[PDB]
Amino acid sequence: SSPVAQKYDYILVGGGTAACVLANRLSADGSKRVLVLEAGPDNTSRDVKIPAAITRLFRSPLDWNLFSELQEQLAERQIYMARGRLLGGSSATNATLYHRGAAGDYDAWGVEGWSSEDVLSWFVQAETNADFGPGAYHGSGGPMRVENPRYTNKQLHTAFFKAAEEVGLTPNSDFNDWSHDHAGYGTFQVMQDKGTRADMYRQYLKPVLGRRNLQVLTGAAVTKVNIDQAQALGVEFSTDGPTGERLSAELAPGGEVIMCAGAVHTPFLLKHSGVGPSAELKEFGIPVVSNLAGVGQNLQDQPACLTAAPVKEKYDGIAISDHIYNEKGQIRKRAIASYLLGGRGGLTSTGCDRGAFVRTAGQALPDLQVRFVPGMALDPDGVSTYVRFAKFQSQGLKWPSGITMQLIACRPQSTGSVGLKSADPFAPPKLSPGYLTDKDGADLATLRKGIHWARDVARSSALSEYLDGELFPGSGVVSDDQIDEYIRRSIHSSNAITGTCKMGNAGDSSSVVDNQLRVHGVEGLRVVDASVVPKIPGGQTGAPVVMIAERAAALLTGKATIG
Numbered sequence: 001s002s003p004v005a006q007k008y009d010y011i012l013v014g015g016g017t018a019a020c021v022l023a024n025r026l027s028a029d030g031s032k033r034v035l036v037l038e039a040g041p042d043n044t045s046r047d048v049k050i051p052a053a054i055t056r057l058f059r060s061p062l063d064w065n066l067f068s069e070l071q072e073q074l075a076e077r078q079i080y081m082a083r084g085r086l087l088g089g090s091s092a093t094n095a096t097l098y099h100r101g102a103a104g105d106y107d108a109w110g111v112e113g114w115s116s117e118d119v120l121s122w123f124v125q126a127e128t129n130a131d132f133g134p135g136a137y138h139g140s141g142g143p144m145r146v147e148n149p150r151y152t153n154k155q156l157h158t159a160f161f162k163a164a165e166e167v168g169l170t171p172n173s174d175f176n177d178w179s180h181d182h183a184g185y186g187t188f189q190v191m192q193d194k195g196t197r198a199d200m201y202r203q204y205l206k207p208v209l210g211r212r213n214l215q216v217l218t219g220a221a222v223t224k225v226n227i228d229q230a231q232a233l234g235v236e237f238s239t240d241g242p243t244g245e246r247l248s249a250e251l252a253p254g255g256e257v258i259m260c261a262g263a264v265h266t267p268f269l270l271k272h273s274g275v276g277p278s279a280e281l282k283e284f285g286i287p288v289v290s291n292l293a294g295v296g297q298n299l300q301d302q303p304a305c306l307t308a309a310p311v312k313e314k315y316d317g318i319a320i321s322d323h324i325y326n327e328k329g330q331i332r333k334r335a336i337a338s339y340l341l342g343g344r345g346g347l348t349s350t351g352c353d354r355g356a357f358v359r360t361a362g363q364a365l366p367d368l369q370v371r372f373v374p375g376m377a378l379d380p381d382g383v384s385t386y387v388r389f390a391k392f393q394s395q396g397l398k399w400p401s402g403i404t405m406q407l408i409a410c411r412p413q414s415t416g417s418v419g420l421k422s423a424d425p426f427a428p429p430k431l432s433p434g435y436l437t438d439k440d441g442a443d444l445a446t447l448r449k450g451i452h453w454a455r456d457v458a459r460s461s462a463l464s465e466y467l468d469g470e471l472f473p474g475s476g477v478v479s480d481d482q483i484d485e486y487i488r489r490s491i492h493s494s495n496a497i498t499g500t501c502k503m504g505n506a507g508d509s510s511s512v513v514d515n516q517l518r519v520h521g522v523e524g525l526r527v528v529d530a531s532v533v534p535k536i537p538g539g540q541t542g543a544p545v546v547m548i549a550e551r552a553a554a555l556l557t558g559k560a561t562i563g
């Protein structure tokens with residue numbers, strides 16, 4: 001009742017990060033009728049816009065609330081895996097850190113037309129940096145906002161860097177400068193506009209909601225993609241939910257369909273629609289249009305564990321928790337004043353924006369990413385701690401002062417999978433991250449060795465002046481075997497998730513999409529979101545999604561070509 005006798009040149013399933021990019025570029029003339037279907041509501045929540053309020057988006061209505069299958073290798077725990085549910089997708093619910101990985105992350109992709117040189121310019125193109133001048137590696141005219149964090153903990157941040165210097169690390173002035181090595185300590189830039197989240201709804205879609213050739217439907221939950229037998233012909237969706245009507249959106253001649261549902265829901269929705277492993281499709285009685293075995297495999301996510309240590313009594317009150325909450329748990333009016341009048345202060349911080357990339361065992365590229373947080377976790381699951389920090393408000397307790405080093409396997413060797421658990425196209429998918437399953441035990445070894453690394457840093461002279469013991473894992477956990485068991489019961493997602501519909505060369509039978517993102521054996525079908533990522537880069541995966549999205553967009557409209 002919303003696409004009524006209307007045929008669209010590009011239907012977009014999903015209204016997230018990449019989808020917000022293409023809608024902008026493809027609606028940019030007037031000849032194309034763009035449609036954008038999004039399960040979740042408009043982007044209007046104040047919790048989206050204030051960075052420190054990220055503590056309220058986890059496990060919230062704006063999250064899909066995905067939980068994984070039992071992971072036997074993880075002491076049989078389900079893993080909560082954050083996924084944004086609103087226009088702007090996970091860009092509106094992320095920690096905003098800006099990371100391209102290294103040039104070798106893209107060279108190693110293998111694919112033709114996506115080397116480090118081919119992608120570099122698409123990055124710069126979409127960037128406007130507040131803190132680096134325009135050059136080979138940074139843009140100034142782009143739609144993304146990028147800035148050095150406008151919050152600084154004058155004691156804990158400076159003691160962290162002195163400490164990482166003590167244990168032998170070198171600084172790194174720009175983790176997205178490919179001319180020098182990617183390892184080292186320093187400061188993560190964040191996709192924020194003067195302390196407001198600079199999500200992709202705000203930077204790309206909100207400035208273009210005027211275009212009459214641009215139709216954006218929130219509340220609109222896609223169920224499948226029409227593929228008359230191969231050619232896609234549209235989508236089916238429901239505006240109310242699993243108890244609503246079964247509408248249909250038709251495409252115009254040549255009208256393509258663009259999978260933007262993200263690394264979790266795209267491979268899922270493709271399967272329900274007929275493209276995937278037949279063995280899995282036959283189990284629920286779904287006709288096979290294409291039998292590509294790569295749909296729903298190769299799921300890569302970066303696992304994390306943490307250490308936590310309180311500060312000495314004498315330095316009580318100097319953590320970021322002390323800057324946001326008072327001793328009674330109420331939000332400080334001073335912090336609100338610095339944020340609303342100046343775009344400064346504790347509320348501009350997602351917390352984890354200082355850190356490092358470290359080689360643990362002479363690897364080609366760093367295997368460990370440390371994230372330092374001048375706040376003290378109260379649960380070894382760092383995601384659950386943020387949820388807890390939210391509910392702590394107004395209870396009347398003082399959150400203890402301290403620090404946290406979150407440790408992350410930024411280039412993991414484990415892979416996962418995304419599958420079908422029901423025929424109900426509104427059911428939670430079969431999600432298995434598969435952390436710690438690589439055949440050499442390397443991911444676990446990277447995380448164990450980060451624990452030793454984190455303890456060295458915390459033992460340094462720079463940090464031992466401020467610290468008083470160790471809460472997590474703590475004094476009991478001494479031997480490697482004990483560290484591993486702690487890692488297993490505390491491993492949490494650092495929220496990347498890539499690869500479930502990977503691109504590859506012609507004759508890559510394991511590949512799903514080709515180097516122009518159209519999928520093997522379907523007409524008018526393309527995938528442009530994090531799923532196409534063939535190897536996860538070394539860093540948080542937001543920025544490369546945009547780069548993919550800006551790239552496909554141009555290619556679609558004949559402004560550049562690949563190969």
Ligand SMILES: Cc1cc2nc3c(=O)[nH]c(=O)nc-3n(C[C@H](O)[C@H](O)[C@H](O)COP(=O)(O)OP(=O)(O)OC[C@H]3O[C@@H](n4cnc5c(N)ncnc54)[C@H](O)[C@@H]3O)c2cc1C
Pocket residue numbers: 013014015016017018019037038039040082083084085086087088089090091093094095096097098099220221222223260261262263265269494495496497529530531540541542543545
């Ligand atoms: C909590 C969190 C923290 C993160 N931190 C960082 C970080 O600091 N820096 C960074 O660079 N990256 C970070 N990431 C990752 C980054 O946000 C993602 O990699 C990126 O946003 C993925 O973009 P996408 O377009 O592939 O998917 P999304 O942005 O998720 O877009 C997919 C969209 O599809 C929609 N959808 C799903 N099913 C349907 C359906 N049936 N019908 C219609 N729409 C549907 C979803 O609602 C969603 O809006 C973080 C991720 C999370 C969750």
